Amino acid sequence: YDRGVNTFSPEGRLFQVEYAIEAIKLGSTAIGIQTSEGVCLAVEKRITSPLMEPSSIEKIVEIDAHIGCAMSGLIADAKTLIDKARVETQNHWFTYNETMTVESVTQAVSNLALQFGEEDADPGAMSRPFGVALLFGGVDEKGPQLFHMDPSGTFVQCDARAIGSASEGAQSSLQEVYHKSMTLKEAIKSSLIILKQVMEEKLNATNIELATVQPGQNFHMFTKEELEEVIKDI
Amino acid sequence: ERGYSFSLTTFSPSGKLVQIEYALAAVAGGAPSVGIKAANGVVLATEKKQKSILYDERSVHKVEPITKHIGLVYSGMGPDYRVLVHRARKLAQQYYLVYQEPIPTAQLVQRVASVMQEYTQSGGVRPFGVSLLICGWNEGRPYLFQSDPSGAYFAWKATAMGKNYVNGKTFLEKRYNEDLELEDAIHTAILTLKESFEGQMTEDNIEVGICNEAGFRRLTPTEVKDYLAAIA
Amino acid sequence: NQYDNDVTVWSPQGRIHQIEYAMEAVKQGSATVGLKSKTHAVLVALKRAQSELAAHQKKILHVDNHIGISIAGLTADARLLCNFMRQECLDSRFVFDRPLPVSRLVSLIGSKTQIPTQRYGRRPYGVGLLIAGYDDMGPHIFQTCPSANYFDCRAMSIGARSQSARTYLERHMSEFMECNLNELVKHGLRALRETLPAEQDLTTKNVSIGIVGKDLEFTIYDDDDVSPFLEGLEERPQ
Amino acid sequence: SSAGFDRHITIFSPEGRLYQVEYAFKAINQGGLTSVAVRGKDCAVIVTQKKVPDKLLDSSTVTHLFKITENIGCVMTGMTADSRSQVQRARYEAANWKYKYGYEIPVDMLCKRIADISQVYTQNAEMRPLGCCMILIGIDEEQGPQVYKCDPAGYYCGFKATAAGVKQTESTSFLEKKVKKKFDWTFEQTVETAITCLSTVLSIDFKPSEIEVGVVTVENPKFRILTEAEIDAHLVALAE
Amino acid sequence: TGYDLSASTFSPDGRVFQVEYAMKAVENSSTAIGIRCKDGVVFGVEKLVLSKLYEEGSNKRLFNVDRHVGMAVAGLLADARSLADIAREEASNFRSNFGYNIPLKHLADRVAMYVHAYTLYSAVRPFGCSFMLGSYSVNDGAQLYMIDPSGVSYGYWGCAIGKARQAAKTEIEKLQMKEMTCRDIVKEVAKIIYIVHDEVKDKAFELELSWVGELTNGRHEIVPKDIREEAEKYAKESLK
Amino acid sequence: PLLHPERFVNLGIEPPKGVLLFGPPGTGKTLCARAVANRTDACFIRVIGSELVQKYVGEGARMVRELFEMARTKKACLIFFDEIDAIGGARFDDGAGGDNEVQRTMLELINQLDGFDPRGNIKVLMATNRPDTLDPALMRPGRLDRKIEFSLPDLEGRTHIFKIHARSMSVERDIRFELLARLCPNSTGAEI
Amino acid sequence: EGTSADREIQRTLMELLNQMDGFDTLHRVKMIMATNRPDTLDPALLRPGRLDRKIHIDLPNEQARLDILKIHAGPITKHGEIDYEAIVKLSDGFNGADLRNVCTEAGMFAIRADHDFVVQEDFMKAVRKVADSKKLESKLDYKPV
Amino acid sequence: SRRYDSRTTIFSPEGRLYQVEYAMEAIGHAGTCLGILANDGVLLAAERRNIHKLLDEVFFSEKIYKLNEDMACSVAGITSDANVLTNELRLIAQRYLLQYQEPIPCEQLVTALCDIKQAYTQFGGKRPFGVSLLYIGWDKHYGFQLYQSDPSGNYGGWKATCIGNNSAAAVSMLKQDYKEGEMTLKSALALAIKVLNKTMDVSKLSAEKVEIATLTRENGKTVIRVLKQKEVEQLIKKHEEEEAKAEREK
Amino acid sequence: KGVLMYGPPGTGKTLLARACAAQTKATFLKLAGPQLVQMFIGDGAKLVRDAFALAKEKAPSIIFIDELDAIGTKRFDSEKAGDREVQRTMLELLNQLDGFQPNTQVKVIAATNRVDILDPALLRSGRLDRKIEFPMPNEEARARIMQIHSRKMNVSPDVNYEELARCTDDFNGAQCKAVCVEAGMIALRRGATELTHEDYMEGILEVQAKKKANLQYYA
Ligand SMILES: Nc1ncnc2c1ncn2[C@@H]1O[C@H](COP(=O)(O)OP(=O)(O)OP(=O)(O)O)[C@@H](O)[C@H]1O
Ligand SMILES: [Mg+2]
Ligand SMILES: [Mg+2]
């Protein structure tokens, strides 16, 4: 009743990877939208007790001056991927003296997702693939770009994505409210409406966090001062 | 290549090591042996039996000299004996290189026991299947010791091992004392080996070793025949 | 069934099962076709996307100016093998200063992928590479498999629901010996359209094309400049 | 009688036994051939049978006798590949001894080194203990002829008359009956007894093309293989 | 059960089961024969065409080991290619070390030892290819050897491997190959392969022939096209 | 086919006979069988696998024989076999003969379904829990034409089960079950 | 602890074991018994005094295989030279009951192709047609103890 | 290869890990040892097990081992692992002295050995050490000290403790009768004699069946003495006569 | 003297028995192994010898034993408890064939799908004489099987059986039959009047019965 970490299924599947894929249905939901004006990212927090400090937990963390990342699923093991992306971008800047594209970062970090092994290697990662789902937003030479990564190591460019426990319902609602001539304000309003619609607890200015990035300025994170303005006029 | 790197000897729910018990059970089925010391030297007696007349009885030996004043006999598995003999020889050599003196008996016993114990905790291996008797004569007082597949050891006055060892110990209980000589020790050793011996005991079925303050040596078949006669 | 959990175990019929399951895995990808004429080699691929708001997955990769590949399977191992190919070709260009012939490269890939199918606790690579190249002897088409067993073929198609395309290619084999690129590509597209249901065919967003020629570098066409090639196709008969 | 993985690897069974080694002893009998070795007053003889079931096979390369050294000869039984590997190891070890110590290697030391090498396989739980046997013959100064035997369990010994193979028991019984008479041994007598032992155990009355004979003696210690003609000479001299 | 999962477990009756499974994997290969003449050897392989898409000359099963040595394989192609590569590297190493072309009696032995090394441990699996080595030298004549996955190599006057090995060797034995020069042997090899593998089993196939001997001054190569054309033209006459 | 045995005859198709239902515990196999038994109009002969174990030698085969005889007495009607995995796994005899008589019972059951004029107008229906231990000779089509699989409900199944099981109680007017469905990813109907 | 309906046999055996070497003695009655594998016979029945001699009947030496081939081959209308020694050399470990089969298969090969005589080639086909079918029979030899 | 493994490192569903538990069940049998201190000097008492009629009685010590100039320790359980552990900590003490030129405090040595002992219960896949043992010593930091180890890895200071098979009864009797800061090295011996009398089934307390070691302080010596068999007998008979007198009082 | 036929399940063994019984004139007895296992001691051997005695009287009769592996299980040695009644009926069967007095008038056929089980003394050359073995159908046979069992159904002229046979390898005969009834019902669901190529293509996926997972992220 014991099988190895790498073992193919009768139908063409890998066992560990399929389990990791289905194990991200336990995390918080997160929504990302891309528009020619800029990129918008939003996520919930899921506070458990009144004794929480809502400022301690965070999901959106910036990779660089123009690249931000949102994580879902488990959180303990995403730190290594984040640190790898940071170091790799800094190394490319040091060697070539420029800023590297979003797609290059995504494909450079996805190479590491499937190196788990049990024999003929150094300790590395013993078994588990990583169990996180990541959304990358940035503004490179060809405009604003959004990418979505997958625990199997597959990355693809999307236009509107929602990942987490409430993925399918949010995606179904999101398919019918999007067009290619949006502004940033209406994108933010739609994301807020969806999160209010699916979230369990009542929405306020401390249950969620949001970030936007534009070609003009760098990665900017909203605070509890301008966050209630976009809420009161919902 | 590579090994396995996980212990094959583990603890049972009742707090016992099974493999050591099975090794002792295998030891209990070996050829019998006896060992005595009395105030002047030590005597080691063992019984050997070829299956048929085709085997050459002078080609191999049971009693083996580690150095000029240490002797060793075994009971249990055959092939495992040579590995231990060779390791003991090596250890005596390193000791003599470092200290420029013949090794004391107790140190050699401790080192051999340490090796035998270490061999039951490492990975992908099984313990040895023999029990040893070691004899020596240093600084006047003779010494006798017995090892164990688990690595423990004891010091004895008289000891019987192999088949029917309980009967040998009981017999030695009512006979042995603390004041005899090597010749009487030989007589009682042959007498107690005759308890489970064959029908007719010849001068070649038995190996006898003697240690006094003159050195270890193996008795030639002639005087073994002389001792077998005029007794029993 | 205990004869199914390792690549070291031999079945009573002398058939290892992990290799068979990898061959099963490679059939889940999208279909792809490849063929060669007198002086050109052409391969065509059909893309796929999950939702209507996601870009289609990329299937054709650029290995070198005279060698191109098409993948089918899972993307991680495909990228690893593609990187190895890049490295080997560059090393050959550096040392002997000449392009590496296709046959030697395929032999190197075959020797590399065979190693994991014999050790303990190692899995094979799940990919379906089709290799198209041009060399001193002319065009070349090659096909590999997870079992480390390459084939030399003059026309092939693999992926999910590839059988009908193979039938069409087989019954139209001779006509490939004379025609030029203009209708060679049309033949490839006709073969590829056969492996779809009767609702949707080709809309310029799901089809990619790659050409290598005697005097033409390896070139990729996708979604904008495919319209010149896509026009001129008769409707699917009903 | 068994509990756990004692039937699959080399660890002690509850009674104190281990089966992964005594399975090799019956793996020996898979070849279906028998070999005999006899030692005389000043010579040693090795005899065996050979079977060529097909005409297409080249009969010149089916020998089981091997020249380990210009003075030491051997015969093998059991699986062929394992025997070839053991031959290779023995050749290398003898050459190394000659290189290191500057004089020829005794036969007993060689047998002991081989047995010590073989004993490891029945100690660790990741190898298989090589089901093939071993018989060596040689000449030693101040000792005369010597005949030694080695087995897969690591038990080597020195004999006066040996048989290895399918018919081991009754051949040893016949040899014991012959040797209890304590008669003088010369070259012709030793060869005749060795041949007749196999002849009466198998009851064949064979031809000079179905056996192989090797001999060593104190007149030219080189190990030599008898040619078919002189083999036929002994065969006809045996039948009065 | 469970005695047939590793390559390091003797069955209770005393034999290894994984190697037997490799054998059964070999017995489904197509066919390959090879016979030696007065002054060389001739190989012959029948190759099945699975579908019309493949090109002629694909996946040759007649490999060229060294400048005067040739190989013919049967089994799983990947393992066969690996064995060919290791033999080629070993031969080059020998030529570099000593200084002349390696004889067959040494190359065949080394490859056999390397193959046998993969049947003891539980961390690797046995190979699955059976192959033939052939050569000709002016100072040693013609040489032919056959090696099986269990690790056994013998010398032959003529041999066959594949599905209908015994059926092929039946008509092989009828020939008096000991006499004629291998210029007329090509016709009889073509005849002997066209008299097997009924057209009911498969529709079409093709013939691959090799050549080595004094006729080529030691080089090993494929036969000229016209000669093969004449050979198959002659062999078609078995329809009578 | 029993309700309208005229379309198939005109079209020349002979319908399948057997069917198997497998999946993890607490999924809906036995309940689906109960629904079928309620709807039908022919026989419905229920058999539990563990009833075929007997004290003496050569007994279970007999009961199988009389079972199919009584089945043939009627015109056309159904057999239900529950918990098959207790009646036969595979033939593996080794060492001392063990689990041998049950294998004879399994062989008689196999024989009654195929070979020398099969049962004719009798349809069987078996459902199991762990189908990895079933014997290959039994799973051959012609005895088990269909292999319906019951998997854990995805998302709509959970809301639908909640609606079915909570539509007969006094509850507040504004509770939303979709959130409850989202809160239990992999679960069966029994837990709901 | 065998089942009831399996102690009745063990009474029948006690009758048998008591009729021979019981309290009262046989005269001029002799007993012959045959068995396929004497591993399993009750140790009281193999005692010297009930079964006194044990006669091993064994697979044939090549000379016996020639003898048996000459027995069973005779009546066939065979034609031309025949060399039995090749057959005897190929058939190894055959039972007596297989050589009869070789002789039947040889004629079966000639009923096809409308002949009414047999030639040596037929024997050489049939030998191998039989010899490879023995692969699926177990190879154990059992011996009393 | 993963079929023959035993997995001697993983957890269990109930939270605990089995191998250390089984080792603690193994330490239950095989011997009895106890230690007590209240003033100048600390005493260890051990129950000899090998009491056959044929023993040569060498090495001047059965179960008491010397680890430094002012460190002694007993042991219970498998004896071979005891030899390993004692040899292992000896050079730990010596290397500390080599580096600092100062006698090593007891606490640091105990912690170092416990770290080595615990290393085997988290990674490596090897059978753990089935040995538990005591420590007695003196140093300028805290005077006299007694400590106890554990195959699991943890430890702790103590004032009076027992480890052998009947440790429960010994502990109960110890906590019933003890006084803090008054017991000189005259009453502690009597207390140990009475406790051993209660625990062991054999009465009359044969002097050859027990072993006593005491540690006392001198100006600069810190002498360790193993009192001979010529002084145990009168101690035992004094205990017997005073017990008989006390019982006769009632 | 007699014929055995063996091989993987689902190949045409019992179909041949039915065919032979349908063509010949002789008396045909049909039997199955498990039917001989009887509760009272000695009751089974009586049935065996009574069946041979009946066939002997009907001069040219032939007798067919199915499921032979229910009787032929290898004998063994045991000291606590074991199986014996079935062994003892087997020793009667092994004696109506061959045995002390030769019977030359009745023909015996027997069938099984596993042979590694059977007692060697039953496989002997004198009893079961020709041991035919049945292989799984190669590519060209599957076309013929499918083309037989669809003989009576109404099917359009655009079906390409040498495509269908080519993407269904590692099927046996029974599954190649079942494809045809699946392809019938698939067409019946849509009310269509005759079968068409896609109905066969879907029937393939019905009879494959592979478990489901999306695996859409591949390629
Ligand atoms: N799809 C469903 N719709 C309604 N109720 C369901 C459904 N699935 C399960 N249930 C409920 O859950 C329970 C399922 O028990 P059921 O007897 O159907 O299981 P089973 O498949 O026979 O299980 P097992 O094999 O473990 O015995 C019942 O209480 C049933 O009402
Ligand atoms: Mg149920
Ligand atoms: Mg049938």
GROMACS .gro file of N, CA, C and O in nm, chain C residues 134-162:
model
  116
  600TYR      N    1   1.645   2.061  -4.155
  600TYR     CA    2   1.703   2.058  -4.288
  600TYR      C    3   1.853   2.040  -4.277
  600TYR      O    4   1.917   2.101  -4.190
  601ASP      N    5   1.910   1.960  -4.365
  601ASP     CA    6   2.050   1.923  -4.354
  601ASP      C    7   2.105   1.900  -4.493
  601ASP      O    8   2.038   1.926  -4.594
  602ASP      N    9   2.229   1.849  -4.500
  602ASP     CA   10   2.293   1.825  -4.628
  602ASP      C   11   2.213   1.729  -4.714
  602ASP      O   12   2.211   1.742  -4.837
  603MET      N   13   2.146   1.632  -4.653
  603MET     CA   14   2.067   1.537  -4.729
  603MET      C   15   1.928   1.587  -4.762
  603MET      O   16   1.852   1.516  -4.828
  604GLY      N   17   1.891   1.707  -4.717
  604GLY     CA   18   1.761   1.761  -4.747
  604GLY      C   19   1.675   1.774  -4.623
  604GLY      O   20   1.724   1.794  -4.513
  605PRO      N   21   1.544   1.763  -4.640
  605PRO     CA   22   1.454   1.772  -4.525
  605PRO      C   23   1.460   1.647  -4.440
  605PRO      O   24   1.508   1.541  -4.482
  606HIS      N   25   1.413   1.660  -4.316
  606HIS     CA   26   1.413   1.550  -4.221
  606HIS      C   27   1.298   1.566  -4.123
  606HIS      O   28   1.279   1.675  -4.067
  607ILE      N   29   1.223   1.458  -4.102
  607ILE     CA   30   1.116   1.452  -4.003
  607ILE      C   31   1.141   1.333  -3.911
  607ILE      O   32   1.165   1.222  -3.959
  608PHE      N   33   1.135   1.357  -3.780
  608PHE     CA   34   1.161   1.254  -3.680
  608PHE      C   35   1.054   1.260  -3.573
  608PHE      O   36   0.998   1.366  -3.545
  609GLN      N   37   1.028   1.145  -3.510
  609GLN     CA   38   0.934   1.135  -3.399
  609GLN      C   39   0.995   1.054  -3.286
  609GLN      O   40   1.052   0.948  -3.310
  610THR      N   41   0.982   1.103  -3.163
  610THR     CA   42   1.027   1.031  -3.045
  610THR      C   43   0.908   0.986  -2.961
  610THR      O   44   0.792   1.007  -2.997
  611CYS      N   45   0.938   0.924  -2.847
  611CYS     CA   46   0.836   0.871  -2.758
  611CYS      C   47   0.897   0.856  -2.620
  611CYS      O   48   1.020   0.856  -2.606
  612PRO      N   49   0.815   0.846  -2.515
  612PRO     CA   50   0.870   0.831  -2.379
  612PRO      C   51   0.951   0.705  -2.359
  612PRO      O   52   1.026   0.697  -2.261
  613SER      N   53   0.938   0.606  -2.446
  613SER     CA   54   1.012   0.482  -2.433
  613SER      C   55   1.154   0.490  -2.487
  613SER      O   56   1.219   0.386  -2.502
  614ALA      N   57   1.203   0.610  -2.518
  614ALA     CA   58   1.338   0.630  -2.573
  614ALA      C   59   1.357   0.554  -2.704
  614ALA      O   60   1.461   0.492  -2.727
  615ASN      N   61   1.257   0.560  -2.791
  615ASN     CA   62   1.257   0.486  -2.917
  615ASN      C   63   1.216   0.580  -3.030
  615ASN      O   64   1.097   0.598  -3.054
  616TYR      N   65   1.313   0.636  -3.101
  616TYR     CA   66   1.282   0.731  -3.207
  616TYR      C   67   1.254   0.660  -3.339
  616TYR      O   68   1.304   0.550  -3.365
  617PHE      N   69   1.174   0.725  -3.423
  617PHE     CA   70   1.135   0.675  -3.553
  617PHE      C   71   1.168   0.776  -3.660
  617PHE      O   72   1.167   0.897  -3.636
  618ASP      N   73   1.196   0.727  -3.780
  618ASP     CA   74   1.219   0.809  -3.897
  618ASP      C   75   1.100   0.794  -3.991
  618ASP      O   76   1.075   0.684  -4.040
  619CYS      N   77   1.029   0.903  -4.017
  619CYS     CA   78   0.907   0.896  -4.095
  619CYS      C   79   0.902   1.013  -4.192
  619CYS      O   80   0.967   1.115  -4.173
  620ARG      N   81   0.822   0.996  -4.298
  620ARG     CA   82   0.805   1.101  -4.397
  620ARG      C   83   0.675   1.179  -4.381
  620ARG      O   84   0.656   1.278  -4.452
  621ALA      N   85   0.586   1.136  -4.292
  621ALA     CA   86   0.464   1.210  -4.262
  621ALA      C   87   0.401   1.152  -4.137
  621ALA      O   88   0.387   1.030  -4.126
  622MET      N   89   0.364   1.235  -4.040
  622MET     CA   90   0.315   1.181  -3.914
  622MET      C   91   0.219   1.278  -3.848
  622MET      O   92   0.214   1.396  -3.883
  623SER      N   93   0.144   1.227  -3.752
  623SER     CA   94   0.051   1.308  -3.674
  623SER      C   95   0.028   1.240  -3.540
  623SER      O   96  -0.003   1.121  -3.537
  624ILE      N   97   0.042   1.314  -3.431
  624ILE     CA   98   0.023   1.257  -3.298
  624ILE      C   99  -0.060   1.351  -3.212
  624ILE      O  100  -0.090   1.464  -3.250
  625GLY      N  101  -0.097   1.302  -3.095
  625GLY     CA  102  -0.185   1.372  -3.004
  625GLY      C  103  -0.317   1.298  -2.989
  625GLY      O  104  -0.333   1.184  -3.032
  626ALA      N  105  -0.413   1.367  -2.929
  626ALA     CA  106  -0.545   1.309  -2.910
  626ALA      C  107  -0.622   1.308  -3.041
  626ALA      O  108  -0.624   1.407  -3.115
  627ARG      N  109  -0.686   1.195  -3.070
  627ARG     CA  110  -0.768   1.178  -3.190
  627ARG      C  111  -0.685   1.203  -3.316
  627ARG      O  112  -0.722   1.282  -3.403
  628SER      N  113  -0.571   1.136  -3.324
  628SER     CA  114  -0.480   1.151  -3.435
  628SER      C  115  -0.501   1.048  -3.544
  628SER      O  116  -0.434   1.056  -3.648
   0.00000   0.00000   0.00000
